[PDB]
Amino acid sequence: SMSLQVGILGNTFANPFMNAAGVMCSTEEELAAMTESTSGSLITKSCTPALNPAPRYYTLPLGSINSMGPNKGFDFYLAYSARHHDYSRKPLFISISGFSAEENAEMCKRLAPVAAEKGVILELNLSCPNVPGKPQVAYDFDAMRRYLAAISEAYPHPFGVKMPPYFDFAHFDAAAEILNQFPKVQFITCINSIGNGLVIDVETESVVIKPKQGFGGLGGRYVFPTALANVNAFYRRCPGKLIFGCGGVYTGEDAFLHVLAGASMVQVGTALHEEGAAIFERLTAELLDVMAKKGYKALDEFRGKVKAM
Amino acid sequence: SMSLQVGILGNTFANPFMNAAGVMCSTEEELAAMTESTSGSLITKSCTPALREGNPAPRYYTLPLGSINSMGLPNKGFDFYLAYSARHHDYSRKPLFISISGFSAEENAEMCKRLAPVAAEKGVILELNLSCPNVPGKPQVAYDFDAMRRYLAAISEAYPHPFGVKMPPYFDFAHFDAAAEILNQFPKVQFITCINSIGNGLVIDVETESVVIKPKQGFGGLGGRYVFPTALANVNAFYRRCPGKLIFGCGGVYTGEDAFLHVLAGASMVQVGTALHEEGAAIFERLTAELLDVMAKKGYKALDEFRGKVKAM
Numbered sequence A: 001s002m003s004l005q006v007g008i009l010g011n012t013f014a015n016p017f018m019n020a021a022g023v024m025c026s027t028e029e030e031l032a033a034m035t036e037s038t039s040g041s042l043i044t045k046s047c048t049p050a051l052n053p054a055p056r057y058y059t060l061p062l063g064s065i066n067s068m069g070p071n072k073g074f075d076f077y078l079a080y081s082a083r084h085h086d087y088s089r090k091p092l093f094i095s096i097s098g099f100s101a102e103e104n105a106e107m108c109k110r111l112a113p114v115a116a117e118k119g120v121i122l123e124l125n126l127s128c129p130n131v132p133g134k135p136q137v138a139y140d141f142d143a144m145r146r147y148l149a150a151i152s153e154a155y156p157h158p159f160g161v162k163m164p165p166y167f168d169f170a171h172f173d174a175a176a177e178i179l180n181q182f183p184k185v186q187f188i189t190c191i192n193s194i195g196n197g198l199v200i201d202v203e204t205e206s207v208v209i210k211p212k213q214g215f216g217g218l219g220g221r222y223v224f225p226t227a228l229a230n231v232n233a234f235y236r237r238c239p240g241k242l243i244f245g246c247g248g249v250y251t252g253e254d255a256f257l258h259v260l261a262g263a264s265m266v267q268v269g270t271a272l273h274e275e276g277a278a279i280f281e282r283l284t285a286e287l288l289d290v291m292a293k294k295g296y297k298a299l300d301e302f303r304g305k306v307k308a309m
Numbered sequence B: 001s002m003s004l005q006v007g008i009l010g011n012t013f014a015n016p017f018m019n020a021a022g023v024m025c026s027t028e029e030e031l032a033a034m035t036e037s038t039s040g041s042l043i044t045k046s047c048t049p050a051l052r053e054g055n056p057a058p059r060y061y062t063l064p065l066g067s068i069n070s071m072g073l074p075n076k077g078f079d080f081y082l083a084y085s086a087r088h089h090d091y092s093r094k095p096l097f098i099s100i101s102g103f104s105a106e107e108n109a110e111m112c113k114r115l116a117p118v119a120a121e122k123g124v125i126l127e128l129n130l131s132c133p134n135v136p137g138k139p140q141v142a143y144d145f146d147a148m149r150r151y152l153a154a155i156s157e158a159y160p161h162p163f164g165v166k167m168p169p170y171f172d173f174a175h176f177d178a179a180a181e182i183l184n185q186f187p188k189v190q191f192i193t194c195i196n197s198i199g200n201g202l203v204i205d206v207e208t209e210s211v212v213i214k215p216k217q218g219f220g221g222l223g224g225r226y227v228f229p230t231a232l233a234n235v236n237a238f239y240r241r242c243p244g245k246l247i248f249g250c251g252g253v254y255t256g257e258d259a260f261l262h263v264l265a266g267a268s269m270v271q272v273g274t275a276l277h278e279e280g281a282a283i284f285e286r287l288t289a290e291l292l293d294v295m296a297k298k299g300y301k302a303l304d305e306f307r308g309k310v311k312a313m
């Protein structure tokens, strides 16, 4: 009849839904909750080789702002991949975001045998937007290329990159031109949060998060049109790669638009932070309802088929 | 005993509010309606040396939380807005800004040369648009710092008066610092408007499975509530890094509280785009009353008492 299945990266995902990196994925107990949910997959917290002040998160009327910075260290998440994750349940992604090309490369050499033995999939975070002193790596195309070449030399398996939003076609073209030179980059996740927004509270006349003078990354309804644009822009310019959509998903109708724009998988951040892992039962049901009303039987029938006018 | 007055640029503004460039300001009838409204000021549509019809329609679309547009600088031509500044605008009612958006530094400098005598006699104030995010082929000038420096040097040579610049949003501190370092080298840049729309978003209709505006494959500039936290961040980022310039806030203003936050972040004037497109010029009566109500509840008597005073917890 109808299916939400996604056959990519040598895996059959039950549906396109997973958590966004950093949400519900830092403790063993959250990973278990994610693994136990009806999501098609899950991803770990972006980790650093070794293990920001609070409040570092804040629920907004239209979404969220965050200045998280915090992880249990690479060894923990590599261990969770090694012999703690139930792969018969769903595939697993691990997010890494070392502070240099060398840290990332070192971490990948370590991951290589786990990935080969267990099937865990690397997502390299080039876009993280609260790193004090270090702007988004992918906003500096010379640094982008150096990271991607370093990882490609150190890592034998395919991997993905999590990208910041871009806001004009020259940057979309330049980024896609670089990514298209690295065959091991098999997927691109669009988008990380929109960086360095600022939220102020009317009553207290104060910023709502402590680090970085209140500047933090935006998620949720604020970022949805930007996320769709980036998904579609890279879908069009990187036809040899998969696009994962991330940003602004609250309903199956939101997920439908991400897929229409080009998304293979659909990550859920702010809405999952608010709803918990039961959201995935609602999203799959809502996605299927939209498809039923349109007569679609599989995602491959409309992925990327947004009609221009 | 409370006041919304703003004393900047040699004028007294009755209040901080004005239209955002491009909204309700393209024809004489719209400019007259802005002048008759209670806004403290107004600004013309960004103009080119010649008249332009702009991008094919539909090119504007109302979103749940704001708007998307790819207008493409439809405008009556510089000569029209110059004549409005010189001969029709009632300066006893309120000050006037003229926005210009030539396609090259030389286009902009020729327009400024003709504007200069009108600015000297009548007092119209120039806003240079470096951020227009829908001109097919031409990317946001202020996203290329070499072009930005070139445009500013060209206008500084051509134009004798202080002027302002309308800026695209930035999203990291390296870019905030690069832009502010350039701006601080041009003494004639006296105000900075943050922000123009967030460029090249994309909206798709679920029912039709197609983009909602025609140009550029449906990609267009976002306005309205989507952009509010980004707009506040840009206002405060430049407020901090350009202490010798005024900051004008633009983006996401639908209420007097939204305007209060802009001023708290450092805005001297507050521009209103999407919300004004939807409500019309009566919005300014509501915004002033709402802003006065926020200040009454806090004991503020003037905007100088809290402008820029956001507390970093």
Ligand SMILES: Cc1cc2nc3c(=O)[nH]c(=O)nc-3n(C[C@H](O)[C@H](O)[C@H](O)COP(=O)(O)O)c2cc1C
Pocket: A020, A021, A022, A023, A045, A046, A057, A064, A065, A066, A068, A095, A125, A128, A162, A191, A192, A193, A218, A219, A220, A221, A223, A246, A247, A248, A249, A267, A268, A269, A270, A271
């Ligand atoms: C609290 C929080 C923590 C996050 N941590 C990470 C992270 O560690 N690595 C990463 O690549 N993205 C991180 N993100 C960004 C999300 O993965 C996602 O890109 C963003 O929130 C937009 O999705 P949304 O609109 O569904 O929230 C984080 C987001 C939030 C709100």
Ligand SMILES: Cc1cc2nc3c(=O)[nH]c(=O)nc-3n(C[C@H](O)[C@H](O)[C@H](O)COP(=O)(O)O)c2cc1C
Pocket: B020, B021, B022, B023, B045, B046, B060, B067, B069, B071, B073, B099, B129, B132, B166, B195, B196, B197, B222, B223, B224, B225, B227, B250, B251, B252, B253, B271, B272, B273, B274, B275
């Ligand atoms: C229909 C429309 C036309 C616009 N035209 C211009 C323009 O000609 N020049 C300019 O600098 N900005 C233009 N803008 C951008 C607005 O001035 C403003 O920066 C943006 O809409 C964000 O403000 P808002 O959230 O209040 O809408 C236009 C915006 C819209 C929606």
